[PDB]
Amino acid sequence: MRVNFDTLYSNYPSSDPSHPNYLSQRDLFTEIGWESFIGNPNYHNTCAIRVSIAFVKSGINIVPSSHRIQKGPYAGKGIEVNMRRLATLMKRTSYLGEPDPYTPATARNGIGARNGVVAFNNIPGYTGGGHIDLVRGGSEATQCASACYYNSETIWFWPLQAS
Amino acid sequence: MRVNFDTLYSNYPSSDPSHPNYLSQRDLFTEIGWESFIGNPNYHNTCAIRVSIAFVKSGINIVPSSHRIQKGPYAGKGIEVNMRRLATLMKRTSYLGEPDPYTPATARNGIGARNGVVAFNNIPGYTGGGHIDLVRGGSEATQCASACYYNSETIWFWPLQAS
Amino acid sequence: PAERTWIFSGAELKQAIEGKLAPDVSDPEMRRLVSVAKSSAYIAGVADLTSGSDWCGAGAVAPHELTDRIYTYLGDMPAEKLDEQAATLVREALKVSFPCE
Amino acid sequence: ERTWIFSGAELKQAIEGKLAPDVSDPEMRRLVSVAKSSAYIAGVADLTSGSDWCGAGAVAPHELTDRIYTYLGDMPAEKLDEQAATLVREALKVSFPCE
DSSP states (O other), rough: OOOHHHHHHOOOOOOOSHHHHHHHHHHHHHHHOOOTTTGGGGGOOOHHHHHHHHHHHHHHSSSSSSSSOSSSTTOOOOEEEEHHHHHHHHHSSSTTTTEEEEOOTTTHHHHTOEEEEEEEEEEEEEEEEEEEEEEOOOBBBOOOOOOOOTTTSEEEEEEOOOO | OOOOHHHHHHHHHHSSSSSSTTTHHHHHHHHHHHHTTTGGGGGGGHHHHHHHHHHTTTTTSSSOSSEEEESSSTTTTTEEEOHHHHHHHHHHHTTTTOOOOEEEEEHHHHTTTTTTEEEEEOOOTTSSSEEEEEEESSSBEEESSSSSOOOSEEEEEEEOOOO | OOOOOOOHHHHHHHHHHHTTTOTOSSSSSHHHHHHHHHHHHHHHHHHHHHHTTTOOOOTSHHHHHHHHHHHHHHHOOGGGGSSSBBBHHHHHHHHHSSSOO | OOOOOHHHHHHHHHHOOOOTTTSSSHHHHHHHHHHHHHHHHHHHHHHHHHTTOOTTTTTTTTHHHHHHHHHHHHGGGGGGGHHHHHHHHHHHHSSSOOO
C-alpha cells in the first residue's frame, strides 16, 4: 500500500488546540454525523476516529470497521473507533505492514527524521489500548499531531516519509 | 567592579532540584547558620540570599546588607534577603551599574548568547519585588540557575560574559 | 481585580493550551511543545486531585482528551471569567464534561 | 487500580529534569521536564490555596517545588506509587501550614 504522508497529514483532524488542524470532539462528531455520541462516555477517546478520517479522506477506506461516517462527501466510509483494532488493521500487509517496535528509551532515535503513523501501546493510568497518531521526526523532538505517550510499554512506528 | 561569571555561577546554590548546584532551603540556611529561620515565613523566598552567597564566595561582599552569614569560612559577610534591595544595590556604579531593561517579548533576544545577572520585576503573586537569578543565554533558551519569570512586568539584565 | 494569588489564570492556561506561553524558548515548534506540556501538566494536577469526587472516568479517558474538553469550556464561558484562577475553571470543565452518577 | 496521570515517582523524576524522552537536546529535556513538574504543582497549589496551605500570593512558585521535592525524598519510598497530587497537597500542608 502506497500513501503520501503530506496528504495523510493534511487530512488529519487534531485534538490539540495548538495544532493548525485542531477540531474539538464536538466539531469532529458533527462533521461525520455522530452528534448523538458527543459526551457519551464510550466515545471520549477519539484517536482512532481521527486516524481513520485521515486515511478515508486520502482515498484509503478502513475495512473492516466498527462504524461508518453518516454525513457529507465520505458518508458510508468506515471508521474504526478502537485504537487496538485500528493498530491491528494497520499491521496487515494490505495496509502499512509490520511496524518498527520501540521502547520509550529508543522511540525518539528510532523514528529519527522519519514521518509516519505511531501507536503507543498500554499507557500507564489508561486502560484503553493506547494512542494512535501521526508523527513528524525532527532534530529537536518527535511531534505527534494530537499527543505523544512515551510513558507507554511499547511504541510501534510505520515510516511513510524520511523528510 | 569585574567578576568572572564562571566563578560566580560555580558559587551559586540553586533552588532547582534538576540543577547540578541544587541546595534545599534547609541545607542553604544550615550552611550559613540560619537554621532558626527555616520555615519562618519572612524567609520563604531565597532568591536574593542565593545570589548574595554567589557574590560573597566569589570575593565580592554585599555592603550594605540586611543580614550576615553566621557560620563557616564566610562568617560576618553580608547577605541581602530582599530581592528589590539587592537589585537596587547591583544597579550602583560600585557594583554592576545600570542594567539593560527588557520586556517579556524582548528579554530572550536581548540577553542573546550573553551570561549575567537577571531581575524579573513585579511577578503576579511573588513578594520581595520579584526574582533575581543568574542566567546563561543559549541558542535553544535562556536558562536561569533557579527559575525564570518572563510573566514579569520588566526584566533587568546585567551582562558579565558573552559566551 | 489585580489582587491575584494564583500561579495560572484562566487566560494563561488557555494561552498555554494554544501553544503560546514559553517566551524563554527560541524555536517556535519547541515553544509550542513546552507551552502544551505546561497546560497538560496543570490540568493533570487538578484532574488527579479531583478524580474521586468532582469527575468520573480517570482510568478510561486519555489525558489529552481532558485538554480538548477544558479548551472548549474556556472558549464557551464568558471572557471575564478568564481572570479567575485556572484550577477552579478546570474543575468546573471536568464536572460538566465527565459528570459522576 | 492506577487511574492517575502522574504518580509520586513520575513527578519526582520530572522535578529532577528526567521526564521528556520525546525531546532531543539534554538541556531542552531538563527545561521541559521541570515545566511539567512546576505546572502540575501549580494546579494542586492554586486549587488548594487557603484551605490546605497558606502563602499563595507571597511565596514564589519555584519555592513550592523545593519544599515538595524534599518531602518526596523524606517520605517512605512506597508512597511514590500513589497519585502525585495528594502527595503535593500533603507537602504544601507540612511546609506552608495555615492556622
